[PDB]
């Protein structure tokens, strides 16, 4: 009447970034109690066994990983108790530990019973209810064994909390709040920021509630804290300190930035770049800094990995991919256009079906905003405008309406000046894009159209015009394509999932791998990246208006337009075509992001379409799933609550709706985020290629700035873009963000092979991983195809590998993580 069990756990200091004692776990230090799934007490709840303590250490187990320890335990379990389906655990030690798993042995297998826990367990006294863990069986609510129903419900209640209180490190409570934690008005009134969310003026997704309470000077803004809480099991430990990349962002803002600033205040290094070679020096000979600065930076975990140093004077950045073959190819019009479909931000270009382009802005405020570009000024390789429009060969990168509402405010800032830009592109007969005109607009210096030129001062004006475009694009990329569309938009679904879908639930099991480290990095970003006087406001053009601009764009965010095929159609770069494998034909045939993306999209779709019917046979089974209905209701009406009235939200009454919702969530969290994230340093590590700010408008003829432009185009370029000190800070942060941690979990992988007992789901997940390996071979073949080199490699000779599913660790320019993990 004894059940043998094996507990696997990791002591605290293995996952920390000062001593563990393994014998302290024995004795009466850790109790487990098995809970019956089949025999109930008088109240219908599963019977609970006796407190059972860890008996001894098990070193003979071969499947142990790094930092893991295994303990033996035996449970007395007589014939009255039934079959175990859950257990309680009570930690009587003063230190927390990380519980991995419990396995219960039987005569054969089945019935081996596996419990996958992966949870931190603090001292029993710190919890209002005893921690509970379930076996790895999957149940929709109506299929839950009756003795486990109440436990399933209770646990969901423990995860929701009551909407009050300051959250502590060990809490596991998931709830929503608005973005009212970014300002710092108690420190200085200039650090006040608008609350984002909860209004029609500033709609915004919700974020994880922390509950620190109000500032003294503003009751609506949350006071600052040393640590921004996330529910405990969202705060990931790492076996290796170099893998705690998310912490490097905090160190950069707290420690490194002040040190760099001191070097410039003391005039120990020149304050400005003077030539393009001064920039190239950063990854060749390095930058020379004072010894006390070097000695302050290189002892720091994570930060020390970002640079090569001689330990006394030099920091060297890694060579960006974009310059690895050609140092000058970034300056070509061909590469400028190519990065719109294969660069860091390849998802904004639109088709143009009429000419000239028109504005949607109020003519009363911004006056006439019809484009000043004339058809007769364009070199379309012998096409007429009529023929180019009709053959769908015209495209546009249109930042006019997005930026015009903010140009006046931005241009008032001290060292910031910009235009609202439009770029017209032409798809040549050879399949590559050609920029044919840039329009630089200001509300109410004038508003002008610049055409391409290769000689004379006009060629420098054209180079500067491209810089203003890419300043627009970089700002839109970081704040919208990256921050808003992935990080910020996903966090409400994470919260809703934990509050309303049991760990037992099939859809919990499907989605939660795609959330790993997403709340954690977001909380660290609210603290150090997107906060008042943080790294983003220091480096990027809009300064204090940066995050508020993303609120204006969120007004037009549409969940169902995040599906890749819908995105391509809505931007006019594809047409619906049932004759094609993916249902859409690309108007730019070689478009690397879209062509590769459609393959990944189809593989995820097949997986979701095979998994869902394993648990839902009919539309009725979706409608009647209480947890699923509560989840989606809360995700829409609380998590994205400022948009809850919009008609495009799926209703979740059918199998098709469930598939579509799951598919979009997985797409956003994996491939979409990867495509916009892991190219940041590869393309933007050369500041001239991806400037983050502009500091002046075009010089007027007859001025000394204009003469300088004639005699020294490199200095003219450098005076306009991001200055030297913010460049050093920006390069550091995008190096972190572009790096794969060695403990990443990639699409097609999971962190435990026993995440469910359902063999049909395991097999379908095997077919998903096999399909991803076959797609990777297809993408390799595309990068070796000479007929695609123009768009897939370009003048920079950089094969588009960002949607290769697999990667090794490091700054690799490839690999699709499961989640928004950095
Ligand atoms: Fe990211």
Curated annotation (Swiss-Prot):
It catalyses: (9Z,12Z)-octadecadienoate + O2 = (13S)-hydroperoxy-(9Z,11E)-octadecadienoate; (9Z,12Z,15Z)-octadecatrienoate + O2 = (13S)-hydroperoxy-(9Z,11E,15Z)-octadecatrienoate; (4Z,7Z,10Z,13Z,16Z,19Z)-docosahexaenoate + O2 = (17S)-hydroperoxy-(4Z,7Z,10Z,13Z,15E,19Z)-docosahexaenoate; (4Z,7Z,10Z,13Z,16Z)-docosapentaenoate + O2 = (17S)-hydroperoxy-(4Z,7Z,10Z,13Z,15E)-docosapentaenoate. This is Seed linoleate 13S-lipoxygenase-1. It is an enzyme of class 1 (oxidoreductase). Induction: The hydroperoxide product serves to activate the resting enzyme. The activation is accompanied by the oxidation of Fe(2+)entadiene structure. Binds 1 Fe cation per subunit. Iron is tightly bound. Inactive below pH 6.0. Its main location: cytoplasm. It comes from Glycine max. Coiled coil: none annotated.
